[PDB]
Amino acid sequence: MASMERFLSVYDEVQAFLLDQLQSKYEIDPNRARYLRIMMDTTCLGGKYFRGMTVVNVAEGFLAVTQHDEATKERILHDACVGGWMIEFLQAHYLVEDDIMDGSVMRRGKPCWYRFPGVTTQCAINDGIILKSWTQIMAWHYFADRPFLKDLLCLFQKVDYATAVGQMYDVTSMCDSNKLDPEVAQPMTTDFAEFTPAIYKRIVKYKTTFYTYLLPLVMGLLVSEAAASVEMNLVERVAHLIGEYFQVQDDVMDCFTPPEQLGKVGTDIEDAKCSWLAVTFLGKANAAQVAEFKANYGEKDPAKVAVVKRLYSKANLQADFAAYEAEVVREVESLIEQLKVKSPTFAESVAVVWEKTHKR
Amino acid sequence: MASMERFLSVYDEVQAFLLDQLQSKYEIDPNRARYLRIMMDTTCLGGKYFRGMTVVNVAEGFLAVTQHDEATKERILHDACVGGWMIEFLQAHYLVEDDIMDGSVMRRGKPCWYRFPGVTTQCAINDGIILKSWTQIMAWHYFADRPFLKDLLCLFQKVDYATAVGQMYDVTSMCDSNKLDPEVAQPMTTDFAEFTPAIYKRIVKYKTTFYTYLLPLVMGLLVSEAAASVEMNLVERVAHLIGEYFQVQDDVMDCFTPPEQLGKVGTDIEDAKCSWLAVTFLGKANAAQVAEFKANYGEKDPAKVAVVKRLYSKANLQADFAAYEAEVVREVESLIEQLKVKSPTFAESVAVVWEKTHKR
Ligand SMILES: [Mg+2]
Ligand SMILES: [Mg+2]
Ligand SMILES: [Mg+2]
Ligand SMILES: [Mg+2]
């Protein structure tokens, strides 16, 4: 079986399990089951499945070098697929709720879930809640007797929480920290003193890297019973590095990739986001450029947004990006090498994760 | 130690643990820690703590009849308090997100969290996410080595999911099921054929009874290592009964308790909710009353809302409520008696849960 066709088949199985259980234990009626099926499909399907497929690919790497009965190989790959779906559904949760939080319009060239006519925010917030509850239902059903159940649940937990903390860091990244206060409407920063590489790295590390790279790698290890084949501090370091790179690419595309190809009209400039572009621009601009940036950033007005893009284009951020990129290559290669000391196999999976991130 | 002062002390401990951990492991800064502290306080404190205190009271009942070292008594009560906080924080999650979903204005005579000036929906949806993630952090930290950890996590999981399913049943209770469709904006029912006792009971069972009565009772059993002292099917039956009664009381108050005393301007009529009042009214109205109800229900217009309240007042729903009440007394008493066969202690805790619900 090709990995993807297996992965997609298990989607059907897991769907059927979840919807069957709603009928037999939760008193659901057919029409509400249908609503939930369409929600699941609309929110969980149609991406590249990169995160979920990482789990599968790590497990396949270990299968190639570890003796097992065929039934065991099948069970490991089935667990890797279920695990990969937990992560895809956790992402689906975050996208549903992030789109509502941000007032986003499109996602993957389609309307955000909450904007569907028969959804609305009222339902969509709860639909996103369900999306995350399904990850736990899947885990308890499919991994009930597995030795890795507690490790897997505890890891998932910690990554989920890191992610929500990262969301807080992201949505508050344009306020001055010393002014955060539930009682007082939050002004945009005027000094941009918190637009630094280190602050940017904290946002991205929590908001993206834990669920996008750490979780799939470690889940692949856990379903393979292979966590003792690796030095976990290196897995953390390499996940944090590659994830930061993925995010930097995303931040560049938000500004410069045509909307039809992006799947989205990017609004980071209007949202005053602490993006890689803003931080890198502020790390090289002269006084005059800084003052032009401050008078134009974080404003809906297209004239001001175009002034911000013009500033980015004249600031030659391609050079800063190539430099960042070369450094990331050095470091990711270094970490891949260190990972070979204990697991050539796993190092190779990480190389593959890196190639697919670096090329996309 | 009085139970409540213990319960509130553990709140402080758990707070400190969560915020300390954010500083030492999640790279949080002090101002964001403060924001989170104020959020926690604002969303978790100031109710009666009925749910969390049920856990404590069930555990205290078993302590009175079970031999234990003093250190063991203390550890059991500490676990009961932590468990009770998990439920309070799970409720806090649901209230934050429900208030945003419903566009609610007040809660406990204070603005809904999302309406605080320095919060906003953008942050509040994520704050509610965090509230639920903290329940898992608490569990993994405080119950790491406990024999009941898996049972407790799996129970919490199932109740959480039941709750979100119940929310879906509640928010969709005024649509015709056969018309649910993500693609089509949902009209209010015109026939009210789905306003039945059985449909009402399904909404309330999932939306409220599992987290409000089942979870606290069973968590008290699990932290006491006492789940084999009870017949679980009876605990389920009695929780479902008492919770339905609690909800019926809530539905009556939404319509008839003055807003200053309610903590809220109730909007169930304008929201076209499948309330106990609507169902009971439709179970006794004549043709003319039914037609007047249909032309006025589910409309913001205060004239139409007052026509609905007038209909309820003339329909003598106090008699239907006294009758419902007497029947609930019979059945809850019957179930308390059946619970004595295996655990007089637990039966008594359930009697106390019932008295505090029946009197409030
Ligand atoms: Mg966002
Ligand atoms: Mg982006
Ligand atoms: Mg609601
Ligand atoms: Mg109510």
Side-chain angles (χ1 to χ4, degrees):
Chain A
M1 198 158 190
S3 306
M4 177 62 76
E5 88 192 37
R6 186 187 291 270
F7 188 67
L8 296 174
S9 303
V10 167
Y11 179 84
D12 273 17
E13 184 190 346
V14 166
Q15 185 169 83
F17 168 73
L18 292 173
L19 300 169
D20 293 356
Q21 177 186 262
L22 281 161
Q23 171 211 57
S24 64
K25 302 210 193 322
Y26 294 87
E27 294 170 38
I28 203 166
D29 55 286
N31 285 292
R32 283 180 184 70
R34 178 171 49 76
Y35 176 101
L36 292 171
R37 185 171 60 60
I38 295 170
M39 188 270 281
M40 191 188 301
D41 292 352
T42 310
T43 59
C44 296
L45 304 177
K48 298 183 281 161
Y49 312 117
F50 159 84
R51 296 166 183 74
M53 287 301 296
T54 295
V55 182
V56 177
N57 294 334
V58 167
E60 290 166 330
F62 287 106
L63 286 176
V65 301
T66 309
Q67 312 198 294
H68 296 292
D69 280 347
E70 184 63 29
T72 301
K73 298 175 187 191
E74 290 291 312
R75 176 204 99 211
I76 287 168
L77 287 165
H78 195 274
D79 283 357
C81 288
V82 172
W85 288 111
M86 291 174 64
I87 307 182
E88 290 296 321
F89 278 48
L90 180 66
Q91 176 171 55
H93 159 84
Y94 277 114
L95 308 179
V96 164
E97 298 304 352
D98 291 355
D99 282 345
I100 294 161
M101 284 174 259
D102 306 337
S104 300
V105 175
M106 302 293 268
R107 157 87 57 200
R108 293 177 201 142
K110 277 191 68 167
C112 305
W113 178 245
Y114 74 102
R115 299 184 67 254
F116 277 50
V119 180
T120 81
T121 297
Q122 181 172 52
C123 284
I125 296 177
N126 197 65
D127 293 338
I129 292 168
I130 286 171
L131 286 160
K132 191 164 60 198
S133 307
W134 282 332
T135 71
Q136 306 306 284
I137 297 294
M138 265 179 241
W140 283 103
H141 178 70
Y142 295 99
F143 306 147
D145 65 38
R146 294 291 190 275
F148 57 77
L149 175 61
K150 291 199 248 210
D151 285 344
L152 187 151
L153 292 168
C154 184
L155 170 66
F156 196 88
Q157 194 273 103
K158 278 183 173 141
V159 164
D160 179 32
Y161 183 45
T163 307
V165 175
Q167 178 67 3
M168 192 199 174
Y169 293 153
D170 198 39
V171 304
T172 64
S173 62
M174 76 296 297
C175 298
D176 291 342
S177 293
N178 59 290
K179 296 274 229 59
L180 295 170
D181 186 347
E183 298 291 318
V184 177
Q186 294 288 301
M188 183 172 35
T189 186
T190 56
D191 70 14
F192 296 85
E194 292 173 65
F195 276 43
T196 62
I199 284 165
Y200 174 77
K201 286 186 195 125
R202 178 185 73 171
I203 296 169
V204 166
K205 171 185 188 200
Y206 292 87
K207 84 151 173 195
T208 314
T209 73
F210 284 92
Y211 89 95
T212 296
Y213 287 96
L214 182 65
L215 180 63
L217 290 170
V218 183
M219 198 170 292
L221 292 165
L222 289 175
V223 302
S224 300
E225 297 281 349
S229 316
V230 309
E231 191 73 63
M232 194 59 65
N233 293 337
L234 291 176
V235 176
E236 294 170 11
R237 292 161 51 199
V238 75
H240 293 326
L241 194 62
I242 297 170
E244 185 190 294
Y245 186 81
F246 173 75
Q247 191 61 62
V248 167
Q249 291 176 308
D250 176 78
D251 288 0
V252 174
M253 293 185 253
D254 192 279
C255 187
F256 298 103
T257 303
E260 73 259 24
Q261 180 172 353
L262 192 60
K264 200 16 175 140
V265 163
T267 54
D268 284 357
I269 293 164
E270 297 94 316
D271 298 339
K273 299 314 294 302
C274 181
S275 69
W276 181 80
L277 293 160
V279 177
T280 305
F281 170 88
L282 292 174
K284 84 191 288 191
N286 65 27
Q289 287 155 351
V290 173
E292 199 167 2
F293 179 91
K294 291 176 176 178
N296 290 273
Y297 200 64
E299 295 278 324
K300 212 89 269 267
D301 184 335
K304 299 192 175 166
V305 174
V307 167
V308 175
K309 296 197 184 198
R310 196 77 49 98
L311 284 169
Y312 288 167
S313 301
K314 293 186 201 129
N316 193 210
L317 299 174
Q318 304 81 11
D320 299 88
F321 182 86
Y324 168 73
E325 178 173 15
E327 183 57 24
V328 178
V329 168
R330 280 172 61 83
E331 280 168 325
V332 175
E333 289 181 6
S334 190
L335 285 168
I336 291 159
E337 296 295 294
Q338 292 281 14
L339 284 166
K340 296 177 176 174
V341 178
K342 295 196 169 173
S343 185
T345 309
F346 182 71
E348 174 59 23
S349 292
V350 176
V352 173
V353 169
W354 171 242
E355 301 171 337
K356 295 159 56 166
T357 303
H358 188 196
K359 53 121 257 141
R360 83 195 166 93
Chain B
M1 198 158 190
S3 306
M4 177 62 76
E5 88 192 37
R6 186 187 291 270
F7 188 67
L8 296 174
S9 303
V10 167
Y11 179 84
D12 273 17
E13 184 190 346
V14 166
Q15 185 169 83
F17 168 73
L18 292 173
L19 300 169
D20 293 356
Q21 177 186 262
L22 281 161
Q23 171 211 57
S24 64
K25 302 210 193 322
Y26 294 87
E27 294 170 38
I28 203 166
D29 55 286
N31 285 292
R32 283 180 184 70
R34 178 171 49 76
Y35 176 101
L36 292 171
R37 185 171 60 60
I38 295 170
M39 188 270 281
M40 191 188 301
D41 292 352
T42 310
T43 59
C44 296
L45 304 177
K48 298 183 281 161
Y49 312 117
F50 159 84
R51 296 166 183 74
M53 287 301 296
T54 295
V55 182
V56 177
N57 294 334
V58 167
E60 290 166 330
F62 287 106
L63 286 176
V65 301
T66 309
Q67 312 198 294
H68 296 292
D69 280 347
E70 184 63 29
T72 301
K73 298 175 187 191
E74 290 291 312
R75 176 204 99 211
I76 287 168
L77 287 165
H78 195 274
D79 283 357
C81 288
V82 172
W85 288 111
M86 291 174 64
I87 307 182
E88 290 296 321
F89 278 48
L90 180 66
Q91 176 171 55
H93 159 84
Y94 277 114
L95 308 179
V96 164
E97 298 304 352
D98 291 355
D99 282 345
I100 294 161
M101 284 174 259
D102 306 337
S104 300
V105 175
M106 302 293 268
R107 157 87 57 200
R108 293 177 201 142
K110 277 191 68 167
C112 305
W113 178 245
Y114 74 102
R115 299 184 67 254
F116 277 50
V119 180
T120 81
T121 297
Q122 181 172 52
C123 284
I125 296 177
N126 197 65
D127 293 338
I129 292 168
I130 286 171
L131 286 160
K132 191 164 60 198
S133 307
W134 282 332
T135 71
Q136 306 306 284
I137 297 294
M138 265 179 241
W140 283 103
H141 178 70
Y142 295 99
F143 306 147
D145 65 38
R146 294 291 190 275
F148 57 77
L149 175 61
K150 291 199 248 210
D151 285 344
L152 187 151
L153 292 168
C154 184
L155 170 66
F156 196 88
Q157 194 273 103
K158 278 183 173 141
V159 164
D160 179 32
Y161 183 45
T163 307
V165 175
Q167 178 67 3
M168 192 199 174
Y169 293 153
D170 198 39
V171 304
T172 64
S173 62
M174 76 296 297
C175 298
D176 291 342
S177 293
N178 59 290
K179 296 274 229 59
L180 295 170
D181 186 347
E183 298 291 318
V184 177
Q186 294 288 301
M188 183 172 35
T189 186
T190 56
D191 70 14
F192 296 85
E194 292 173 65
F195 276 43
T196 62
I199 284 165
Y200 174 77
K201 286 186 195 125
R202 178 185 73 171
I203 296 169
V204 166
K205 171 185 188 200
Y206 292 87
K207 84 151 173 195
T208 314
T209 73
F210 284 92
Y211 89 95
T212 296
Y213 287 96
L214 182 65
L215 180 63
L217 290 170
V218 183
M219 198 170 292
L221 292 165
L222 289 175
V223 302
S224 300
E225 297 281 349
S229 316
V230 309
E231 191 73 63
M232 194 59 65
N233 293 337
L234 291 176
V235 176
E236 294 170 11
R237 292 161 51 199
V238 75
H240 293 326
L241 194 62
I242 297 170
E244 185 190 294
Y245 186 81
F246 173 75
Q247 191 61 62
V248 167
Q249 291 176 308
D250 176 78
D251 288 0
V252 174
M253 293 185 253
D254 192 279
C255 187
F256 298 103
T257 303
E260 73 259 24
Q261 180 172 353
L262 192 60
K264 200 16 175 140
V265 163
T267 54
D268 284 357
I269 293 164
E270 297 94 316
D271 298 339
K273 299 314 294 302
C274 181
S275 69
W276 181 80
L277 293 160
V279 177
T280 305
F281 170 88
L282 292 174
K284 84 191 288 191
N286 65 27
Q289 287 155 351
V290 173
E292 199 167 2
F293 179 91
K294 291 176 176 178
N296 290 273
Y297 200 64
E299 295 278 324
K300 212 89 269 267
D301 184 335
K304 299 192 175 166
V305 174
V307 167
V308 175
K309 296 197 184 198
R310 196 77 49 98
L311 284 169
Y312 288 167
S313 301
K314 293 186 201 129
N316 193 210
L317 299 174
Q318 304 81 11
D320 299 88
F321 182 86
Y324 168 73
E325 178 173 15
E327 183 57 24
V328 178
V329 168
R330 280 172 61 83
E331 280 168 325
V332 175
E333 289 181 6
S334 190
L335 285 168
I336 291 159
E337 296 295 294
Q338 292 281 14
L339 284 166
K340 296 177 176 174
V341 178
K342 295 196 169 173
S343 185
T345 309
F346 182 71
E348 174 59 23
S349 292
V350 176
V352 173
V353 169
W354 171 242
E355 301 171 337
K356 295 159 56 166
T357 303
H358 188 196
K359 53 121 257 141
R360 83 195 166 93

